[PDB]
């Protein structure tokens, strides 16, 4: 569960190509249960980090509350 739900996968994939351009290789992080800790990852400084980098702080790509994308539900919630 800790590998299919990582802390950050960065804003997009074109920035992965930019880091290769005039830069270094790519990082592989492996599944990791405990020790993904400290500030700066998902503390309150993760909110300041998310605002600077352009991403969302809680559960980086989304704020998942259901199990399927439901147009019906969003139309009735509008």
């Amino acid at each position: 569960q800790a590998e299919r739900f990582p802390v950050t996968r960065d804003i997009s994939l074109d920035v992965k190509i930019d880091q290769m351009k005039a830069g270094l290789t790519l990082t592989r992080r492996l599944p990791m249960v405990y020790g993904t800790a400290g500030m700066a990852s998902h503390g309150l400084n993760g909110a300041i980090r998310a605002s600077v980098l352009g991403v969302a702080y809680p559960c980086h790509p989304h704020c998942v509350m259901s199990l399927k994308r439901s147009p019906t539900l969003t139309t009735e919630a509008a």
Binding site: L13, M20, L24, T25, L26, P61, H62, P71, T74
Partner: protein, 46 residues
């Protein structure tokens, strides 16, 4: 001059091999990640 260019050549082959190694890592990851992108869903207002 042929020897100085010769020892030049294995270093240039080694540096080009390292840049190949970087490129194979990026190509492999981009191809693998380019199926798991979440497609966006748009719905009319009315």
């Amino acid at each position: 001059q042929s020897q100085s260019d010769l020892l030049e050549a294995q270093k240039m082959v080694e540096e080009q091999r390292l840049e190949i190694q970087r490129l194979y890592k990026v190509i492999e990851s981009l191809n693998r990640e380019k199926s798991l992108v979440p497609p966006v869903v748009l719905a009319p207002a009315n």
